Amino acid sequence: GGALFVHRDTPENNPDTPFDFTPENYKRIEAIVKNYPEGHQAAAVLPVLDLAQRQNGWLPISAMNKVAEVLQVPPMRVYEVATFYTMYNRK
Amino acid sequence: LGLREIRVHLCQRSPGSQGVRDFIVQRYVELKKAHPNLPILIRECSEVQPKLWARYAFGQEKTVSLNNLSADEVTRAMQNVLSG
Amino acid sequence: TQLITVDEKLDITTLTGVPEEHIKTRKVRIFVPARNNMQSGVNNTKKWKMEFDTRERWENPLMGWASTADPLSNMVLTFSAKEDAIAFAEKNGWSYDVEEKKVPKPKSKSYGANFSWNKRTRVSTK
Amino acid sequence: GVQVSPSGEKITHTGQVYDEKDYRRVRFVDRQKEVNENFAIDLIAQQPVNEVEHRIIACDGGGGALGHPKVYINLDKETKTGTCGYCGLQFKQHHH
Amino acid sequence: KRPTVRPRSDVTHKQLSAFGEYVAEILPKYVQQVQVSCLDELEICIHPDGVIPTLTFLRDHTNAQFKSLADLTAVDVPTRQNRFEIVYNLLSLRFNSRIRVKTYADELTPIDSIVSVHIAANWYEREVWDMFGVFFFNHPDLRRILTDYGFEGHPFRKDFPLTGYVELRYDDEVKRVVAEPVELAQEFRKFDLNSPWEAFPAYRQPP
Amino acid sequence: PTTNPPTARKFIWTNHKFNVSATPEQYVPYSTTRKKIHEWVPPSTPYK
Amino acid sequence: ASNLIEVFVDGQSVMVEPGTTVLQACEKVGMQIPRFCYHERLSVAGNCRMCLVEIEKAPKVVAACAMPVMKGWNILTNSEKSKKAREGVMEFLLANHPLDCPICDQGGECDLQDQSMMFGSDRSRFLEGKRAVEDKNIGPLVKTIMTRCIQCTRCIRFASEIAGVDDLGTTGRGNDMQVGTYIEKMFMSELSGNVIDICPVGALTSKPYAFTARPWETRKTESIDVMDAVGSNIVVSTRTGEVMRILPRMHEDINEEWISDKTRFAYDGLKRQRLTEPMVRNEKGLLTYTSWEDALSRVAGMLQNFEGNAVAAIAGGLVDAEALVALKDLLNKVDSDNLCTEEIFPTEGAGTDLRSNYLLNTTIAGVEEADVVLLVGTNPRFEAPLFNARIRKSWLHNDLKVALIGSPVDLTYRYDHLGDSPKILQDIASGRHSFCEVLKDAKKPMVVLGSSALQRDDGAAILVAVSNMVQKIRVTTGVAAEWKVMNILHRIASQVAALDLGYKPGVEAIRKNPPKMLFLLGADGGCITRQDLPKDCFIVYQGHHGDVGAPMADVILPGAAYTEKSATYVNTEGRAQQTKVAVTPPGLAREDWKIIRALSEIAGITLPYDTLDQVRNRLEEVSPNLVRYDDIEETNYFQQASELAKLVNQEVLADPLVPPQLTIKDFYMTDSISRASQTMAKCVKAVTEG
Amino acid sequence: TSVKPIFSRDLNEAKRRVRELYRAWYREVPNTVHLMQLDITVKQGRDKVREMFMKNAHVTDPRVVDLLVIKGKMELQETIKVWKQRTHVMRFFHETETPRPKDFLSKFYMGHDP
Ligand code: SF4
Ligand code: SF4
Ligand code: FES
Ligand SMILES: [Zn+2]
Secondary structure (H helix, E strand, C coil), X not given: CCCCCCCCCCCCCCCCCXXXXXXXXXXXXXXXXXXXXXXXXXXXXXXXXXXXXXXXXXXXXXXXXXXXXXXXXXXXXXXXHHHHCCCCCCC | CCEEEEEEEEECCCCCCHHHHHHHHHHHHHHHXXXXXXXXXXXXXXXXXXXXXXXXXXXXXXXXXXXXXXXXXXHHHHHHHHHC | CCCEECCXXXXXXXXXXXXXHHHHCXXXXXXXXXXXXXXXXCCCCXXXXXEECCCCCEECCCCCCEEECCHHHHCEEEECCHHHHHHHHHHHCCEEEECCXXXXXXXXXXXXXCCCCCCCCCCCCC | CCCECCCCCXXXXXXXXXXXXXXXXXXHCCCCCCCCXXXXXXXXXXXXXXEEXXXXXXXXXXXXXXXXXXXXXECCCCCCCEECCCCCCEEEECCC | CCCCCCCCCHHHHHHHHHXXXXXXXXXXXXXXXXXXXXXCXXXXXXXXXXXXXXXXXXXXXXXXXXXXXXXXXXXXXXXXXXXXXXEEEEEECCCCEEEEEECCCECCECEECCCCCCCCHHHHHHHHHHHHCCCEXXXXXXXXXXXXXXXXXXXXXXXXXXXXXXXXXXXXXXXXXXXXXXXXXXXXXXXXXXXXXXXXXXXXXXX | CCCCCCCCCCCCCCCCCXXXXXXXXXXXXXXXXXXXXXXXXXXXXXXX | CCCCEXXXXXXXXXXXXXXXXXXXXXXXXXXXXXXXXXXXXXXCCCCCCCCEEEECCCCCEEECCCCECCCXXXXXXXXXXXXXXXXXXXXXXXXXXXXXXXXXXXXXXXXHHHHHHHHCCCCCCCCCCCCCCCCCCCCCCEEECHHHCCCCCHHHHHHHHHHCCCCCEEECCHHHCEEECCCCCCCCCCCCCHHHHHCCCCCEEECCCCCCCCXXXXXXXXEEXXXXXXXXXXXXXXXXXXXXXXXXXXCCCCCCCCCCHHHHHHHHHHHCCECCCCEEECCCCCEEECCXXXXXXXXXXXXXXXXXXXXXXXXXXXXXXXXXXXXXXXXHHCCCCCCEECCCCCCCCCHHHEHHHCCCCCCHHHHHCCCEEEEECCCHHHHCHHHHHHHHXXXXXXXXXXXXXXCCCCCCCCCEEEECCCCHHHHHHCCCCCHHHHHHHCCCEEEEEEHHHHCCCCHHHHHHHHHHHHHHHHHHHCCCCCCCCEEEECCCCCHHHHHHCCCECCCHHHHHCCCCEEEEECCCCCCCCHHHCCCCCEEEEEECECCCCCCCCCEEEECCCHHHCCCEEECCCCCEEECCCCCCCCCCCCCHHHHHHHHHHHCCCCCCCCCHHHHHHHHHHHCHHHCCCCCCCCCCCHHHHHHHHCCCCCCCCCCCCCCCCCCHHHCCCCCHHHHCXXXXXXXHHHHHHC | CEECCCCCXXXXXXXXXXXXXXXXXXXXXXXXXXXXXXXXCHHHHHHHHHHHHHCCCCCCCHHHHHHHHHHHHHHHHHHHCCCCCHXXXXXXXXXXXXXXXXXXXXXXXXCCCC
16 A cells, blocks of 8 residues: 555666765764664664655655665665564555 | 507406505606606596506507506506507 | 205296296395485385396387396395395395495484584574 | 457467368368457457556456456556456556 | 263273283293283283293183184384284183284294194295295195295285286287286385374374 | 357357267367477588 | 583483573474474564474473573473463464465465464454555566565574675564565575575565476485586475476585575576587588487597597586596596696696595585684685675684785675785795794694685686695694695586596686697586687587587587586585486486497497496596595695695786686576576676666 | 204205106196197197296205195196196296396397396
8 A cells, every 4th residue: 555665767866866975974873883783783764754854855766876886785684674664654 | 659648447446456556556656756747646536447548649549457456567558558 | 754864055037937048147136225315215225126137128119118138127025134135036046236225324413503602503594 | 358369260369270281181182170250369469558646556357256366456656557466357446 | 971082990000901911821831922902901921931831821711711813914124133023913702802813923033823723824824934935834734825826925915015016918929828027107206194293192202 | 048048258169069080170189388498500601 | 611501301311411491402392383483594583483482380481592591491492381481473474474375486385374274273363354465576586575574684684694785674563573674675685585594484485486487396316516516405396397496405414404596597598509410511501400310420430530639528517427537537537637627727737636625625614613714816706605604604703804805895794805926825825924823823724725716827826825825824733633725616516526437627728739629518617618629629518408519519429417417516515415306307318428428339449337336436446436425534644735736836827817708797698598498688788787 | 054944854855746747647638638639749838847846946945846746746736637728838838028138238138128
């Protein structure tokens, strides 16, 4: 239903959709990542993703992919989070 | 003569084949330097009676046992094969 | 009726009506059937089987069915151990190539390994 | 439909026909080759898509216990159409 | 009380177990592994040297009047070295009870006949011979009963193919019915049907 | 069937046929399958 | 005593190591507890909750897949609580499961069916409407039908822990949890078809095998794979004289339960571009159909009029030891010894005289004991996956540290990339490369070289440099004298047997002294060609496909395939493994050694052996390692080979040695059986497109 | 190495029985080529008897020999009495079975069978 849990590319929501973090968001991200041990930085996924949501208002696929790229995580490990938690707006 | 191959059969852990392993480690190197282009095959197996197969031209093979020898009997048999 | 000294190897070929062909030219296989990986059941990996060599199968021109001149194409015997099968084969005069039984090796397993501080067992898929 | 081959033999709905050089066509000499002229694929294609207003529809075929097991079909993908696995009926989300 | 399961009474179990003790302690020289089943059936296993004594005792003895030989069978189990499990199912009209006696044989290990006890066993022993290859002693006329007049083999042996080794037809050349090696238009299809999941844990074979 | 008639279906025949054995227009069996294994198509050119 | 502990299973006692689970103990006493999520090679996950048992004097039930066993615990497998837990879990699993069994390829071999019949109830009190899920599309090999997923996570854990993809997961939560990807993405790795095997409920199925059969019909023949040189154990399912699929076997030492997609999906080539009849040239120079008598007479004449150094043979990779030894005996009886392979191994030094120099002496199961691994000129991923899978298993559990001298690739695991040129070898040996520190502090290293690196002209130089490095490694670390550091990984099945049989590897001798009567047995790679041979050279080609060697032939003797014959194939370790007959060859095709013995009889020659046992007695004569089936023979003569090979004056070329299979689109089609498969073509067309 | 004997405590008594059986068959052949109206001579029948006897000449266990003699006496009964017709008697000669050659090469030309 409305919460489909799948993603079919569109012009508004595609990997080429223009998302990117602001130089302030990057420093906030650095701090967040610093709030966790040095080997475990894949735990900032939730705060960084909600941050992107705040900047952009919602979450397109490019946003998740960029979060992954930043944290060096597989993007599916971010798709799972986004789909699981409801505070994350994918429309 | 018409010798083409020498293929040595033996065991890895057995007394009878003890003469072939010593022979190998001490002289296979020098012998394969002397005859560089001659196959000298060692196919060591388990619970196999050691033998020396010398096959000459037109597919004709010989076989002389090596059970419970020293390395010197092995050397003499191998050189007898080589010479003919 | 006391005992008798036979002192030879058993041979039953002459009493089984089996033709020379299917005794001399037959290679039996003795084995424990391998588990089917489409399933995790291990109850068909217990009893030893005896299976014969496969022979020709040609389509029937009329319909297109599989034909054979091999009576033993579907012969399967079930034994509780390896020596029993070897004895049956020797007795009936067949040639056999045996295949040892494959038991999985015991494996260390821990649910905590999935959650580790420094090892690579740490999984990202709960 | 029932199309013929260069030899005149009719091609069944399985795509089967004997080659011109095949000797197995003597069985059809002074006799006929039985084919079914009603190809089920063309027929089930001739049927229309049944629209629905629910995202998940069931299909028992028809007649209840005279049809097939009841399966449920998802209709989220608005480009595609859901096809029963037993019958070939198609369904589409009306409101997309 | 439950409508699908089968009503079970222990009284028959006790009766048959007591009679089994009776038989075991009255024929120790032959009796092996008496046993009774969940379904009420008595099974007395013996050494083949005891066939005639056991059956004669069970026929003539007063507390055991099994004087009707219902059946006489064999069972090929190629695993064990003595394959054939010969079975004697019997009936007492005086006590309205049955009993089963079993022996074991081999291709080259014959047993004694019981036609001196039960004349019903002539044809049954001929059948066992024709089907499995077990030879009986002191049999009046031991020949084939069911197989063809020149048939080679014992078909009920598990090692014998279901379809046999030969096949018959008529040949105009010789003007006779002849036997040719088997050749089928459709080969029998062997279906592997055993489920790989243990089904009855009460019969589990410990390794 | 003049009062309780059958149900109408396209694929049903409109002309019943009797047993047509020992005639033409009879039934001859055949394989409804295609070739399983395909042979190599040798080239039309020589090695020269 | 050695930290074991006593535990009971319905009274019966058994001593189990600590950390052992309830399930493993119940197995140790022969009992198999139900399962839908535990697979014996994947991380534990207590999801299905079908493993539930009660512990004596314990209120609730534990998950036998995850609960370790404590002292004195009695495990009640067949008590009321356990039965009712199983029945409840079955009710729940089947509540939303679709009535698809008669269209589900998993029918007859479904764990859900059998566990419902053996452990669950026979009724449904679900009076509601089930759910449905829109099916994915993850490629041309795996068909996804996700109304049938019981969310066991096996696919996910397998992709992550064994394949190393990490592209599968669970989207959503609750009853609407959708296993799979969140985006359209083809899941085309080289260990993808095993997710089919570990999905118990037909959600993931083979598109090729779709609808083609049912498990009870199939007759199961135990054979091995030949696409690679690992010797993967397989079962060949047949249905009325026809191969229906390839299904793996279990061999904890080689292919525990896995096989490559090339191995299980390239059986569609045995149904295409096949040689079924002996062919011969007509006056016009075209290939026409003829008999066995005629072609064998032609070949026997041509053989009679030739002698040594004018005759020659070539093997191709899918060849069996029997054909190799028979052809060798034939050529020997006509005095030729130019028997060559298509794969280049260096005879410079000890060559094939010592098996230590062309085997995997640290057998595949030795990667589990190792601490450091060094890859030279290999992409073991695309070249011998199961070996790469074992290296990944070690990299996971035993913290193995990998390194690679070669072109940078993925490998599905992380590795220390040193360089590309082979001059890194001298620097690792003489003790100047960073890696030397690891190497010195290590305890059980193993170097492994790729035949691919030996195909370039500097194979002998690479080999001698690796020998130097291995010797100095053994000297520094202090190996135990039973640990083998030097290894060689082949990508060609018949190679090890050919080298054990005396074949002179490489086609250099042919180029050197070209023949007038060339034998071309299974060779369809294209090393030699008529532009390199005299004019009017009589070529006779054996084989089972018509890819390369048959077009250029004057006679064609159609042979058999691995699913069509019994044959010994030796793997990189020396483990002789026998194939078995599942089908007979098509048309007038025949066993290869049979063809060759008949050829001899037609000629004045006559080989002694009329049967297969005699051919294998001959094998025992030549090399007795070819008959010890499933066994591996230790070989301990590397010191001498190194003393000998320290005397060649060749140096490496400094060219960056890179492997031929650099991506997966260069993995699906490598031999004729693969190039003749429409399925592998579908795969390449999926990967190249995206 | 110790077993129960069926009839013969050694191979010589079994050979005595085998010879008795050979005599019986050799004496019977003519009566059954007369009665059954077989279209063969009396020499062919006795050659066939001898061939079927040699077919099991390799045996050394007296029990196998005793059982073979029992089977032979069963057949001789079926034949002395006319329980079996000329069909079953001529089954022995295999007048229609195309004789498979023992030449490796012919077996190679026709089929995959060894
Ligand atoms: S798709 Fe199959 S393997 Fe994956 S979680 Fe579902 S049932 Fe398990
Ligand atoms: S997975 Fe099993 S239970 Fe489900 S539809 Fe397929 S065969 Fe039936
Ligand atoms: S087997 Fe334990 S929860 Fe699945
Ligand atoms: Zn439907």
